A tleap script that builds the chain and sets N, CA, C and O, in Angstrom:
source leaprc.protein.ff14SB
mol = sequence {
  NLYS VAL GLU LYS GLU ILE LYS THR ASN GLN
  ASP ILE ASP VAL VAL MET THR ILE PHE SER
  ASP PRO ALA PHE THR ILE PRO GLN ILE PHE
  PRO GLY ILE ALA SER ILE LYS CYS ILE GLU
  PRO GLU ILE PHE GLU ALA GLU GLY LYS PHE
  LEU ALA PHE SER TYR LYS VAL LYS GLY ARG
  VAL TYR LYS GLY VAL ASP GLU VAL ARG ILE
  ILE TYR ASP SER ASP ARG GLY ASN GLY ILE
  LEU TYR ILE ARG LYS LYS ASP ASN ASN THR
  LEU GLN ILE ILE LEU GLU HIE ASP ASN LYS
  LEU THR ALA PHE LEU GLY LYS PRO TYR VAL
  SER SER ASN LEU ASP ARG LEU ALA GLU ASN
  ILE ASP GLU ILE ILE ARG LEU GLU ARG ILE
  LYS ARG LYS CILE
}
set mol.1.N position { 97.450 63.619 167.241 }
set mol.1.CA position { 98.882 63.912 167.546 }
set mol.1.C position { 99.569 62.682 168.119 }
set mol.1.O position { 98.935 61.854 168.773 }
set mol.2.N position { 100.878 62.566 167.867 }
set mol.2.CA position { 101.722 61.477 168.379 }
set mol.2.C position { 102.676 62.194 169.320 }
set mol.2.O position { 103.207 63.247 168.968 }
set mol.3.N position { 102.906 61.645 170.512 }
set mol.3.CA position { 103.866 62.291 171.404 }
set mol.3.C position { 104.698 61.334 172.225 }
set mol.3.O position { 104.453 60.128 172.238 }
set mol.4.N position { 105.689 61.888 172.914 }
set mol.4.CA position { 106.647 61.086 173.648 }
set mol.4.C position { 107.323 61.984 174.652 }
set mol.4.O position { 107.754 63.086 174.313 }
set mol.5.N position { 107.422 61.520 175.902 }
set mol.5.CA position { 108.174 62.189 176.927 }
set mol.5.C position { 109.555 61.611 176.864 }
set mol.5.O position { 109.725 60.401 176.714 }
set mol.6.N position { 110.564 62.479 176.979 }
set mol.6.CA position { 111.951 62.052 177.036 }
set mol.6.C position { 112.571 62.593 178.300 }
set mol.6.O position { 112.443 63.774 178.621 }
set mol.7.N position { 113.254 61.700 179.022 }
set mol.7.CA position { 114.014 62.022 180.211 }
set mol.7.C position { 115.501 62.094 179.857 }
set mol.7.O position { 116.012 61.236 179.138 }
set mol.8.N position { 116.189 63.113 180.358 }
set mol.8.CA position { 117.606 63.299 180.046 }
set mol.8.C position { 118.406 63.798 181.243 }
set mol.8.O position { 117.934 64.626 182.022 }
set mol.9.N position { 119.626 63.280 181.375 }
set mol.9.CA position { 120.624 63.814 182.285 }
set mol.9.C position { 121.596 64.768 181.612 }
set mol.9.O position { 122.535 65.243 182.251 }
set mol.10.N position { 121.387 65.058 180.328 }
set mol.10.CA position { 122.251 66.001 179.635 }
set mol.10.C position { 121.743 67.404 179.961 }
set mol.10.O position { 120.609 67.553 180.417 }
set mol.11.N position { 122.555 68.431 179.737 }
set mol.11.CA position { 122.121 69.797 180.015 }
set mol.11.C position { 120.909 70.056 179.135 }
set mol.11.O position { 120.995 70.003 177.908 }
set mol.12.N position { 119.788 70.334 179.771 }
set mol.12.CA position { 118.520 70.431 179.053 }
set mol.12.C position { 118.500 71.529 178.003 }
set mol.12.O position { 117.798 71.407 176.999 }
set mol.13.N position { 119.254 72.596 178.214 }
set mol.13.CA position { 119.214 73.690 177.306 }
set mol.13.C position { 120.026 73.359 176.074 }
set mol.13.O position { 119.689 73.777 174.966 }
set mol.14.N position { 121.097 72.609 176.267 }
set mol.14.CA position { 121.834 72.056 175.122 }
set mol.14.C position { 120.968 71.116 174.303 }
set mol.14.O position { 120.962 71.187 173.074 }
set mol.15.N position { 120.241 70.239 174.974 }
set mol.15.CA position { 119.379 69.303 174.285 }
set mol.15.C position { 118.308 70.005 173.445 }
set mol.15.O position { 118.104 69.687 172.273 }
set mol.16.N position { 117.636 70.961 174.073 }
set mol.16.CA position { 116.645 71.796 173.372 }
set mol.16.C position { 117.258 72.497 172.150 }
set mol.16.O position { 116.657 72.511 171.076 }
set mol.17.N position { 118.442 73.072 172.314 }
set mol.17.CA position { 119.146 73.696 171.198 }
set mol.17.C position { 119.410 72.743 170.029 }
set mol.17.O position { 119.208 73.115 168.873 }
set mol.18.N position { 119.862 71.513 170.321 }
set mol.18.CA position { 120.048 70.507 169.300 }
set mol.18.C position { 118.709 70.167 168.600 }
set mol.18.O position { 118.677 70.008 167.380 }
set mol.19.N position { 117.640 70.060 169.348 }
set mol.19.CA position { 116.330 69.770 168.756 }
set mol.19.C position { 115.859 70.912 167.833 }
set mol.19.O position { 115.054 70.688 166.929 }
set mol.20.N position { 116.365 72.137 168.066 }
set mol.20.CA position { 116.037 73.318 167.192 }
set mol.20.C position { 116.779 73.287 165.862 }
set mol.20.O position { 116.459 74.062 164.961 }
set mol.21.N position { 117.767 72.401 165.726 }
set mol.21.CA position { 118.396 72.146 164.429 }
set mol.21.C position { 117.622 71.107 163.611 }
set mol.21.O position { 117.570 69.935 163.985 }
set mol.22.N position { 117.016 71.538 162.487 }
set mol.22.CA position { 116.214 70.549 161.780 }
set mol.22.C position { 117.033 69.426 161.168 }
set mol.22.O position { 116.491 68.358 160.885 }
set mol.23.N position { 118.333 69.642 160.955 }
set mol.23.CA position { 119.208 68.597 160.437 }
set mol.23.C position { 119.342 67.465 161.454 }
set mol.23.O position { 119.678 66.335 161.098 }
set mol.24.N position { 119.078 67.778 162.711 }
set mol.24.CA position { 119.019 66.736 163.741 }
set mol.24.C position { 117.645 66.102 163.784 }
set mol.24.O position { 117.474 64.899 163.591 }
set mol.25.N position { 116.666 66.970 164.048 }
set mol.25.CA position { 115.323 66.574 164.482 }
set mol.25.C position { 114.540 65.839 163.391 }
set mol.25.O position { 113.875 64.844 163.678 }
set mol.26.N position { 114.609 66.315 162.147 }
set mol.26.CA position { 113.792 65.738 161.076 }
set mol.26.C position { 114.220 64.304 160.713 }
set mol.26.O position { 113.369 63.416 160.675 }
set mol.27.N position { 115.531 64.049 160.443 }
set mol.27.CA position { 115.933 62.665 160.189 }
set mol.27.C position { 115.693 61.731 161.385 }
set mol.27.O position { 115.445 60.539 161.203 }
set mol.28.N position { 115.767 62.268 162.588 }
set mol.28.CA position { 115.539 61.449 163.807 }
set mol.28.C position { 114.103 60.997 163.990 }
set mol.28.O position { 113.848 59.918 164.525 }
set mol.29.N position { 113.149 61.836 163.538 }
set mol.29.CA position { 111.715 61.631 163.857 }
set mol.29.C position { 110.848 61.236 162.671 }
set mol.29.O position { 109.997 60.355 162.788 }
set mol.30.N position { 111.061 61.890 161.523 }
set mol.30.CA position { 110.209 61.648 160.369 }
set mol.30.C position { 110.471 60.254 159.784 }
set mol.30.O position { 111.583 59.740 159.905 }
set mol.31.N position { 109.450 59.624 159.140 }
set mol.31.CA position { 109.683 58.280 158.582 }
set mol.31.C position { 110.655 58.236 157.406 }
set mol.31.O position { 110.414 58.862 156.374 }
set mol.32.N position { 111.749 57.499 157.564 }
set mol.32.CA position { 112.598 57.092 156.428 }
set mol.32.C position { 113.192 58.252 155.637 }
set mol.32.O position { 113.221 58.221 154.407 }
set mol.33.N position { 113.666 59.277 156.350 }
set mol.33.CA position { 114.335 60.432 155.718 }
set mol.33.C position { 115.630 60.014 155.006 }
set mol.33.O position { 116.512 59.415 155.621 }
set mol.34.N position { 115.738 60.328 153.718 }
set mol.34.CA position { 116.922 59.945 152.934 }
set mol.34.C position { 117.711 61.148 152.358 }
set mol.34.O position { 118.830 60.994 151.868 }
set mol.35.N position { 117.105 62.327 152.431 }
set mol.35.CA position { 117.719 63.594 152.029 }
set mol.35.C position { 117.324 64.710 152.992 }
set mol.35.O position { 116.192 64.733 153.476 }
set mol.36.N position { 118.243 65.634 153.276 }
set mol.36.CA position { 117.918 66.810 154.077 }
set mol.36.C position { 118.850 67.941 153.632 }
set mol.36.O position { 120.049 67.736 153.446 }
set mol.37.N position { 118.281 69.132 153.466 }
set mol.37.CA position { 119.007 70.334 153.074 }
set mol.37.C position { 118.773 71.371 154.147 }
set mol.37.O position { 117.632 71.736 154.429 }
set mol.38.N position { 119.858 71.850 154.751 }
set mol.38.CA position { 119.794 72.784 155.887 }
set mol.38.C position { 120.756 73.966 155.772 }
set mol.38.O position { 121.455 74.349 156.710 }
set mol.39.N position { 120.743 74.509 154.570 }
set mol.39.CA position { 121.200 75.836 154.183 }
set mol.39.C position { 121.211 76.916 155.299 }
set mol.39.O position { 122.146 76.987 156.096 }
set mol.40.N position { 120.157 77.744 155.333 }
set mol.40.CA position { 119.900 78.734 156.376 }
set mol.40.C position { 119.470 77.955 157.632 }
set mol.40.O position { 118.797 76.932 157.515 }
set mol.41.N position { 119.859 78.436 158.847 }
set mol.41.CA position { 119.799 77.599 160.084 }
set mol.41.C position { 118.388 77.278 160.579 }
set mol.41.O position { 118.199 76.374 161.393 }
set mol.42.N position { 117.407 78.020 160.084 }
set mol.42.CA position { 116.047 77.797 160.516 }
set mol.42.C position { 115.138 77.229 159.425 }
set mol.42.O position { 113.927 77.134 159.628 }
set mol.43.N position { 115.697 76.851 158.272 }
set mol.43.CA position { 114.900 76.300 157.167 }
set mol.43.C position { 115.411 74.950 156.726 }
set mol.43.O position { 116.618 74.708 156.741 }
set mol.44.N position { 114.502 74.058 156.330 }
set mol.44.CA position { 114.921 72.784 155.838 }
set mol.44.C position { 114.024 72.287 154.718 }
set mol.44.O position { 112.857 72.662 154.611 }
set mol.45.N position { 114.603 71.435 153.892 }
set mol.45.CA position { 113.856 70.602 152.954 }
set mol.45.C position { 114.361 69.183 153.122 }
set mol.45.O position { 115.566 68.951 153.229 }
set mol.46.N position { 113.435 68.234 153.145 }
set mol.46.CA position { 113.819 66.855 153.265 }
set mol.46.C position { 112.933 65.949 152.398 }
set mol.46.O position { 111.824 66.315 152.010 }
set mol.47.N position { 113.460 64.769 152.114 }
set mol.47.CA position { 112.769 63.745 151.350 }
set mol.47.C position { 112.841 62.453 152.120 }
set mol.47.O position { 113.886 62.101 152.667 }
set mol.48.N position { 111.722 61.740 152.165 }
set mol.48.CA position { 111.736 60.443 152.778 }
set mol.48.C position { 110.774 59.493 152.062 }
set mol.48.O position { 110.104 59.862 151.098 }
set mol.49.N position { 110.733 58.267 152.565 }
set mol.49.CA position { 109.784 57.245 152.101 }
set mol.49.C position { 109.389 56.297 153.241 }
set mol.49.O position { 110.217 55.950 154.083 }
set mol.50.N position { 108.120 55.884 153.257 }
set mol.50.CA position { 107.682 54.783 154.114 }
set mol.50.C position { 106.613 54.022 153.331 }
set mol.50.O position { 105.815 54.618 152.608 }
set mol.51.N position { 106.611 52.707 153.486 }
set mol.51.CA position { 105.826 51.834 152.616 }
set mol.51.C position { 106.103 52.228 151.152 }
set mol.51.O position { 107.257 52.448 150.787 }
set mol.52.N position { 105.064 52.319 150.316 }
set mol.52.CA position { 105.248 52.723 148.916 }
set mol.52.C position { 105.287 54.234 148.685 }
set mol.52.O position { 105.328 54.685 147.540 }
set mol.53.N position { 105.273 55.015 149.764 }
set mol.53.CA position { 105.045 56.438 149.654 }
set mol.53.C position { 106.251 57.328 149.892 }
set mol.53.O position { 106.657 57.540 151.035 }
set mol.54.N position { 106.825 57.847 148.816 }
set mol.54.CA position { 107.821 58.914 148.906 }
set mol.54.C position { 107.160 60.236 149.221 }
set mol.54.O position { 106.033 60.494 148.798 }
set mol.55.N position { 107.867 61.080 149.971 }
set mol.55.CA position { 107.337 62.388 150.261 }
set mol.55.C position { 108.472 63.396 150.318 }
set mol.55.O position { 109.625 63.061 150.589 }
set mol.56.N position { 108.104 64.638 150.053 }
set mol.56.CA position { 109.005 65.794 150.138 }
set mol.56.C position { 108.459 66.714 151.192 }
set mol.56.O position { 107.318 67.164 151.091 }
set mol.57.N position { 109.254 67.005 152.212 }
set mol.57.CA position { 108.811 67.895 153.263 }
set mol.57.C position { 109.804 69.084 153.346 }
set mol.57.O position { 111.009 68.918 153.154 }
set mol.58.N position { 109.269 70.261 153.633 }
set mol.58.CA position { 110.115 71.435 153.919 }
set mol.58.C position { 109.422 72.269 154.991 }
set mol.58.O position { 108.226 72.098 155.224 }
set mol.59.N position { 110.145 73.159 155.641 }
set mol.59.CA position { 109.550 73.872 156.740 }
set mol.59.C position { 110.524 74.828 157.438 }
set mol.59.O position { 111.630 75.077 156.957 }
set mol.60.N position { 110.087 75.351 158.573 }
set mol.60.CA position { 110.783 76.427 159.306 }
set mol.60.C position { 110.697 76.187 160.796 }
set mol.60.O position { 109.679 75.713 161.302 }
set mol.61.N position { 111.776 76.518 161.505 }
set mol.61.CA position { 111.876 76.351 162.947 }
set mol.61.C position { 111.725 77.708 163.631 }
set mol.61.O position { 112.346 78.693 163.232 }
set mol.62.N position { 110.891 77.740 164.665 }
set mol.62.CA position { 110.704 78.909 165.472 }
set mol.62.C position { 111.071 78.523 166.893 }
set mol.62.O position { 110.585 77.531 167.436 }
set mol.63.N position { 111.941 79.335 167.482 }
set mol.63.CA position { 112.377 79.171 168.858 }
set mol.63.C position { 111.604 80.087 169.804 }
set mol.63.O position { 111.385 81.260 169.501 }
set mol.64.N position { 111.195 79.549 170.947 }
set mol.64.CA position { 110.493 80.313 171.952 }
set mol.64.C position { 111.053 80.048 173.326 }
set mol.64.O position { 112.036 79.322 173.472 }
set mol.65.N position { 110.435 80.631 174.337 }
set mol.65.CA position { 110.810 80.296 175.684 }
set mol.65.C position { 110.508 78.810 175.851 }
set mol.65.O position { 109.363 78.374 175.735 }
set mol.66.N position { 111.553 78.051 176.122 }
set mol.66.CA position { 111.390 76.624 176.493 }
set mol.66.C position { 110.644 75.791 175.452 }
set mol.66.O position { 110.045 74.767 175.781 }
set mol.67.N position { 110.682 76.236 174.199 }
set mol.67.CA position { 109.919 75.558 173.164 }
set mol.67.C position { 110.586 75.695 171.810 }
set mol.67.O position { 111.186 76.726 171.506 }
set mol.68.N position { 110.480 74.647 170.993 }
set mol.68.CA position { 110.920 74.672 169.600 }
set mol.68.C position { 109.684 74.247 168.793 }
set mol.68.O position { 109.072 73.224 169.101 }
set mol.69.N position { 109.315 75.017 167.772 }
set mol.69.CA position { 108.123 74.732 166.999 }
set mol.69.C position { 108.565 74.649 165.541 }
set mol.69.O position { 109.087 75.624 165.000 }
set mol.70.N position { 108.364 73.505 164.900 }
set mol.70.CA position { 108.782 73.313 163.499 }
set mol.70.C position { 107.511 73.199 162.663 }
set mol.70.O position { 106.761 72.230 162.776 }
set mol.71.N position { 107.284 74.202 161.828 }
set mol.71.CA position { 106.094 74.221 160.962 }
set mol.71.C position { 106.480 73.683 159.599 }
set mol.71.O position { 107.440 74.163 158.996 }
set mol.72.N position { 105.746 72.686 159.097 }
set mol.72.CA position { 106.172 72.066 157.850 }
set mol.72.C position { 104.996 71.833 156.887 }
set mol.72.O position { 103.837 71.788 157.301 }
set mol.73.N position { 105.321 71.688 155.598 }
set mol.73.CA position { 104.371 71.269 154.543 }
set mol.73.C position { 104.954 70.186 153.701 }
set mol.73.O position { 106.163 70.174 153.471 }
set mol.74.N position { 104.132 69.257 153.223 }
set mol.74.CA position { 104.653 68.229 152.337 }
set mol.74.C position { 103.553 67.832 151.386 }
set mol.74.O position { 102.411 68.274 151.516 }
set mol.75.N position { 103.906 66.985 150.418 }
set mol.75.CA position { 102.939 66.455 149.442 }
set mol.75.C position { 101.981 65.437 150.080 }
set mol.75.O position { 101.061 64.948 149.424 }
set mol.76.N position { 102.203 65.124 151.358 }
set mol.76.CA position { 101.381 64.121 152.056 }
set mol.76.C position { 100.693 64.737 153.274 }
set mol.76.O position { 100.145 64.010 154.103 }
set mol.77.N position { 100.715 66.059 153.392 }
set mol.77.CA position { 100.029 66.717 154.505 }
set mol.77.C position { 100.950 67.721 155.185 }
set mol.77.O position { 102.165 67.683 154.995 }
set mol.78.N position { 100.372 68.617 155.976 }
set mol.78.CA position { 101.131 69.705 156.640 }
set mol.78.C position { 100.971 69.527 158.143 }
set mol.78.O position { 100.112 68.766 158.588 }
set mol.79.N position { 101.789 70.221 158.928 }
set mol.79.CA position { 101.722 70.024 160.346 }
set mol.79.C position { 102.679 70.858 161.150 }
set mol.79.O position { 103.371 71.728 160.621 }
set mol.80.N position { 102.714 70.580 162.459 }
set mol.80.CA position { 103.686 71.206 163.377 }
set mol.80.C position { 104.323 70.136 164.266 }
set mol.80.O position { 103.637 69.262 164.795 }
set mol.81.N position { 105.640 70.223 164.419 }
set mol.81.CA position { 106.357 69.417 165.416 }
set mol.81.C position { 106.781 70.319 166.564 }
set mol.81.O position { 107.473 71.315 166.359 }
set mol.82.N position { 106.361 69.964 167.771 }
set mol.82.CA position { 106.764 70.709 168.953 }
set mol.82.C position { 107.765 69.935 169.781 }
set mol.82.O position { 107.640 68.723 169.956 }
set mol.83.N position { 108.768 70.649 170.294 }
set mol.83.CA position { 109.627 70.132 171.355 }
set mol.83.C position { 109.557 71.099 172.568 }
set mol.83.O position { 109.975 72.253 172.465 }
set mol.84.N position { 109.029 70.620 173.709 }
set mol.84.CA position { 108.754 71.489 174.851 }
set mol.84.C position { 109.541 71.020 176.067 }
set mol.84.O position { 109.456 69.855 176.454 }
set mol.85.N position { 110.309 71.930 176.670 }
set mol.85.CA position { 110.944 71.646 177.923 }
set mol.85.C position { 109.864 71.614 179.011 }
set mol.85.O position { 109.071 72.548 179.125 }
set mol.86.N position { 109.835 70.545 179.805 }
set mol.86.CA position { 108.873 70.413 180.898 }
set mol.86.C position { 109.508 70.722 182.244 }
set mol.86.O position { 108.874 71.343 183.097 }
set mol.87.N position { 110.761 70.293 182.449 }
set mol.87.CA position { 111.545 70.686 183.631 }
set mol.87.C position { 112.987 70.463 183.279 }
set mol.87.O position { 113.326 70.309 182.105 }
set mol.88.N position { 113.862 70.444 184.295 }
set mol.88.CA position { 115.316 70.365 184.066 }
set mol.88.C position { 115.800 69.030 183.482 }
set mol.88.O position { 116.930 68.937 183.001 }
set mol.89.N position { 114.952 68.005 183.524 }
set mol.89.CA position { 115.382 66.678 183.058 }
set mol.89.C position { 114.407 66.015 182.111 }
set mol.89.O position { 114.521 64.816 181.855 }
set mol.90.N position { 113.439 66.772 181.577 }
set mol.90.CA position { 112.326 66.170 180.858 }
set mol.90.C position { 111.868 67.114 179.760 }
set mol.90.O position { 111.761 68.323 179.965 }
set mol.91.N position { 111.598 66.544 178.592 }
set mol.91.CA position { 110.957 67.264 177.540 }
set mol.91.C position { 109.814 66.458 176.947 }
set mol.91.O position { 109.667 65.265 177.212 }
set mol.92.N position { 109.005 67.138 176.136 }
set mol.92.CA position { 107.919 66.480 175.403 }
set mol.92.C position { 108.051 66.791 173.936 }
set mol.92.O position { 108.353 67.923 173.558 }
set mol.93.N position { 107.824 65.783 173.098 }
set mol.93.CA position { 107.767 65.933 171.639 }
set mol.93.C position { 106.343 65.601 171.225 }
set mol.93.O position { 105.807 64.549 171.572 }
set mol.94.N position { 105.736 66.522 170.473 }
set mol.94.CA position { 104.378 66.326 169.997 }
set mol.94.C position { 104.398 66.608 168.495 }
set mol.94.O position { 104.789 67.696 168.073 }
set mol.95.N position { 103.979 65.635 167.692 }
set mol.95.CA position { 103.801 65.814 166.256 }
set mol.95.C position { 102.316 65.852 165.891 }
set mol.95.O position { 101.585 64.892 166.134 }
set mol.96.N position { 101.880 66.967 165.308 }
set mol.96.CA position { 100.483 67.094 164.890 }
set mol.96.C position { 100.424 67.286 163.371 }
set mol.96.O position { 100.891 68.300 162.851 }
set mol.97.N position { 99.850 66.312 162.666 }
set mol.97.CA position { 99.832 66.303 161.217 }
set mol.97.C position { 98.378 66.473 160.734 }
set mol.97.O position { 97.465 65.900 161.329 }
set mol.98.N position { 98.159 67.243 159.677 }
set mol.98.CA position { 96.783 67.603 159.267 }
set mol.98.C position { 96.102 66.597 158.322 }
set mol.98.O position { 94.938 66.768 157.960 }
set mol.99.N position { 96.838 65.555 157.931 }
set mol.99.CA position { 96.297 64.548 157.023 }
set mol.99.C position { 96.103 63.208 157.714 }
set mol.99.O position { 97.069 62.527 158.059 }
set mol.100.N position { 94.839 62.839 157.912 }
set mol.100.CA position { 94.505 61.672 158.729 }
set mol.100.C position { 95.053 60.372 158.134 }
set mol.100.O position { 95.552 59.512 158.861 }
set mol.101.N position { 94.955 60.236 156.811 }
set mol.101.CA position { 95.400 59.031 156.118 }
set mol.101.C position { 96.902 58.885 156.340 }
set mol.101.O position { 97.383 57.836 156.766 }
set mol.102.N position { 97.632 59.959 156.043 }
set mol.102.CA position { 99.092 59.963 156.171 }
set mol.102.C position { 99.515 59.719 157.608 }
set mol.102.O position { 100.441 58.950 157.866 }
set mol.103.N position { 98.839 60.373 158.546 }
set mol.103.CA position { 99.125 60.123 159.979 }
set mol.103.C position { 98.962 58.628 160.348 }
set mol.103.O position { 99.814 58.060 161.031 }
set mol.104.N position { 97.869 58.006 159.894 }
set mol.104.CA position { 97.630 56.579 160.152 }
set mol.104.C position { 98.767 55.686 159.663 }
set mol.104.O position { 99.230 54.797 160.378 }
set mol.105.N position { 99.203 55.939 158.443 }
set mol.105.CA position { 100.235 55.110 157.847 }
set mol.105.C position { 101.606 55.425 158.447 }
set mol.105.O position { 102.411 54.518 158.661 }
set mol.106.N position { 101.875 56.700 158.718 }
set mol.106.CA position { 103.219 57.103 159.205 }
set mol.106.C position { 103.404 56.829 160.685 }
set mol.106.O position { 104.532 56.786 161.177 }
set mol.107.N position { 102.289 56.642 161.404 }
set mol.107.CA position { 102.356 56.540 162.872 }
set mol.107.C position { 103.346 55.519 163.450 }
set mol.107.O position { 104.162 55.886 164.296 }
set mol.108.N position { 103.298 54.236 163.015 }
set mol.108.CA position { 104.268 53.334 163.649 }
set mol.108.C position { 105.741 53.684 163.377 }
set mol.108.O position { 106.607 53.347 164.184 }
set mol.109.N position { 106.032 54.348 162.263 }
set mol.109.CA position { 107.408 54.776 161.926 }
set mol.109.C position { 107.830 55.920 162.840 }
set mol.109.O position { 108.943 55.929 163.368 }
set mol.110.N position { 106.937 56.874 163.020 }
set mol.110.CA position { 107.207 57.981 163.938 }
set mol.110.C position { 107.309 57.506 165.380 }
set mol.110.O position { 108.223 57.911 166.099 }
set mol.111.N position { 106.381 56.649 165.817 }
set mol.111.CA position { 106.453 56.128 167.197 }
set mol.111.C position { 107.707 55.286 167.418 }
set mol.111.O position { 108.300 55.349 168.495 }
set mol.112.N position { 108.122 54.505 166.431 }
set mol.112.CA position { 109.368 53.737 166.599 }
set mol.112.C position { 110.579 54.693 166.764 }
set mol.112.O position { 111.452 54.473 167.604 }
set mol.113.N position { 110.597 55.729 165.959 }
set mol.113.CA position { 111.626 56.766 166.068 }
set mol.113.C position { 111.617 57.444 167.416 }
set mol.113.O position { 112.667 57.617 168.035 }
set mol.114.N position { 110.433 57.832 167.881 }
set mol.114.CA position { 110.356 58.465 169.191 }
set mol.114.C position { 110.787 57.559 170.342 }
set mol.114.O position { 111.450 58.011 171.275 }
set mol.115.N position { 110.413 56.281 170.276 }
set mol.115.CA position { 110.855 55.279 171.248 }
set mol.115.C position { 112.350 55.124 171.253 }
set mol.115.O position { 112.971 55.117 172.316 }
set mol.116.N position { 112.956 54.995 170.054 }
set mol.116.CA position { 114.402 54.873 169.943 }
set mol.116.C position { 115.107 56.138 170.488 }
set mol.116.O position { 116.097 56.028 171.212 }
set mol.117.N position { 114.604 57.314 170.146 }
set mol.117.CA position { 115.159 58.560 170.690 }
set mol.117.C position { 115.058 58.591 172.224 }
set mol.117.O position { 116.028 58.947 172.893 }
set mol.118.N position { 113.906 58.225 172.782 }
set mol.118.CA position { 113.737 58.244 174.235 }
set mol.118.C position { 114.720 57.302 174.934 }
set mol.118.O position { 115.290 57.651 175.967 }
set mol.119.N position { 114.916 56.110 174.371 }
set mol.119.CA position { 115.757 55.059 174.957 }
set mol.119.C position { 117.237 55.340 174.846 }
set mol.119.O position { 118.019 54.846 175.657 }
set mol.120.N position { 117.647 56.137 173.842 }
set mol.120.CA position { 119.051 56.412 173.551 }
set mol.120.C position { 119.461 57.898 173.633 }
set mol.120.O position { 120.528 58.275 173.150 }
set mol.121.N position { 118.619 58.723 174.240 }
set mol.121.CA position { 118.784 60.194 174.063 }
set mol.121.C position { 120.124 60.701 174.544 }
set mol.121.O position { 120.748 61.524 173.874 }
set mol.122.N position { 120.583 60.226 175.696 }
set mol.122.CA position { 121.810 60.830 176.236 }
set mol.122.C position { 123.102 60.464 175.438 }
set mol.122.O position { 124.019 61.276 175.318 }
set mol.123.N position { 123.138 59.232 174.906 }
set mol.123.CA position { 124.213 58.735 174.018 }
set mol.123.C position { 124.143 59.464 172.678 }
set mol.123.O position { 125.172 59.861 172.132 }
set mol.124.N position { 122.932 59.640 172.149 }
set mol.124.CA position { 122.797 60.406 170.871 }
set mol.124.C position { 123.320 61.872 171.061 }
set mol.124.O position { 124.079 62.375 170.233 }
set mol.125.N position { 122.907 62.519 172.138 }
set mol.125.CA position { 123.252 63.912 172.372 }
set mol.125.C position { 124.714 64.057 172.733 }
set mol.125.O position { 125.343 65.046 172.357 }
set mol.126.N position { 125.274 63.093 173.455 }
set mol.126.CA position { 126.692 63.169 173.800 }
set mol.126.C position { 127.544 63.228 172.523 }
set mol.126.O position { 128.444 64.057 172.394 }
set mol.127.N position { 127.237 62.337 171.602 }
set mol.127.CA position { 127.887 62.350 170.270 }
set mol.127.C position { 127.626 63.637 169.463 }
set mol.127.O position { 128.545 64.164 168.836 }
set mol.128.N position { 126.384 64.144 169.474 }
set mol.128.CA position { 126.085 65.443 168.837 }
set mol.128.C position { 126.947 66.556 169.424 }
set mol.128.O position { 127.500 67.371 168.687 }
set mol.129.N position { 127.058 66.587 170.738 }
set mol.129.CA position { 127.872 67.600 171.398 }
set mol.129.C position { 129.359 67.569 171.029 }
set mol.129.O position { 130.001 68.612 170.909 }
set mol.130.N position { 129.888 66.368 170.853 }
set mol.130.CA position { 131.312 66.202 170.530 }
set mol.130.C position { 131.499 66.796 169.131 }
set mol.130.O position { 132.452 67.535 168.881 }
set mol.131.N position { 130.581 66.466 168.230 }
set mol.131.CA position { 130.684 66.923 166.830 }
set mol.131.C position { 130.434 68.424 166.703 }
set mol.131.O position { 131.112 69.103 165.932 }
set mol.132.N position { 129.462 68.943 167.457 }
set mol.132.CA position { 129.111 70.389 167.398 }
set mol.132.C position { 129.977 71.299 168.233 }
set mol.132.O position { 129.942 72.519 168.076 }
set mol.133.N position { 130.770 70.699 169.136 }
set mol.133.CA position { 131.592 71.419 170.111 }
set mol.133.C position { 130.754 72.352 170.997 }
set mol.133.O position { 131.073 73.526 171.182 }
set mol.134.N position { 129.671 71.780 171.535 }
set mol.134.CA position { 128.831 72.487 172.504 }
set mol.134.C position { 128.593 71.656 173.745 }
set mol.134.O position { 127.905 72.100 174.663 }
savepdb mol mol.pdb
quit
């Protein structure tokens, strides 16, 4: 698994809600997302590429107490992305992928994404909020 703690001064419940939108979360985290379809609010299909490898991913979001769980399948392996509220100013993102080869190759792309999200989270969410009116 690849993970990242994020600290935020934004309203944590708003942040968690935004992370439950796959149109936000998947392009932000997955390697090189170039297409995303978010029809029904809890389902997505996306396409991306990293190195020579194009992939098609689709999946479903489940909301829980203080948790968002995104279950996905792709031509390069299946997995779960978790977003967990830890306290009022902190969350954890954990990506667990079932294909070791794909995880090895995708890892620096996912970690770079998670680092960028951690470093810019409040500016990213402030803009999301303006657009979503939440």
